[PDB]
Amino acid sequence: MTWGRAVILEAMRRYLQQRRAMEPWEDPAGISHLEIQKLMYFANEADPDLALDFTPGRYGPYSERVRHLLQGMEGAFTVGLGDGTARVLANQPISLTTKGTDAITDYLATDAAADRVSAAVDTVLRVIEGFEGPYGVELLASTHWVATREGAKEPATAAAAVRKWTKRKGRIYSDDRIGVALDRILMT
């Protein structure tokens, strides 16, 4: 198992448990594809050698290689992507299978990269603490992108920059929500 797949399987296992307490009305087993993208965005920032080449988008950063990784595991270590359409932005719930859970536990026990996978996942869990759920990680990831890729490190500047990618404000990309995210990105 490459360690990018391991980072995926391990982020999924621990994030699900963090989310089950924070947003307990969310699915007991499925993580949306778009949530896994945000998790992997932060993992890539914690460990650039992953090389997942994120680009900004309406729902935050997106990696075509993360989707390729999930696809290669489908019906094996994970389930839920199914057979999507070519280049459609599909957001399905993805679960760890029993085999996947067994594979990642075996992996962390012996693999050469095992401590590195855990270090990256622990860094991600720390940054998103309190922001678990499909909205919270999108908000954090989008703010992080504009703060580290476009210099948008001040509240006024980061709000404008986030909303140019999201196309939305409402109560979800108001200055106040982005201010809170920005404070977290700056602290971690």
């Binding site: 924070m22 947003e23 307990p24 603490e129 922001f131 759920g133 109560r171 979800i172 995210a181 977290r184």
Partner: protein
Amino acid sequence: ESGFVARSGGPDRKRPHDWIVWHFTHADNLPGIITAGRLLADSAVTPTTEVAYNPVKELRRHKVVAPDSRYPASMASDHVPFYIAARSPMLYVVCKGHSGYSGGAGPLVHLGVALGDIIDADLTWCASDGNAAASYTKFSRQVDTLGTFVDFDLLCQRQWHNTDDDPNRQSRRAAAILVYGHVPFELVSYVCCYNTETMTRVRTLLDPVGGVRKYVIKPGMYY
């Protein structure tokens, strides 16, 4: 409906004192609440039976609740939560079940209190604008802006699921009045139950305790 009701007519943005706020509990907890004569925060004591998911409750013990510098240093678990819309996400969690409870809506009782009764009773309270455990949630006790502070429109909807462009709707439906410490039980002016056997049990308990409470059976305020 949404479970967003008021005591005069329908809820109005500019009259939050008339909003009815809701606390749900298991019917078997009601004798204990009767004995104490008040609803107690989780930190006070452990309840007769727990309906909530245990990791959710452990989270509330570490969530700072602080609208003002004058507000007592306190956690979410130091408060009794009253959801503004009775059909809420927290109630769905309990109704769908988990490892700690699996009874459905049958034994769940909604205790409705008018916000103006909480205020006039000189209780310490504040409002969250959404999921109280989330780091991006704010608390406020500014009565005159409560209407804009919570997502009033969403709380009135009969349909409120998340969408791709707004994955934060369920969270905003969890807006609640958190009352610090306890709520005297005489402030409960509305009792709602899911079925008739529950209502019969609730009335056999409450008939000697109190009186002027409006009793209603509504499957529609549950899941």
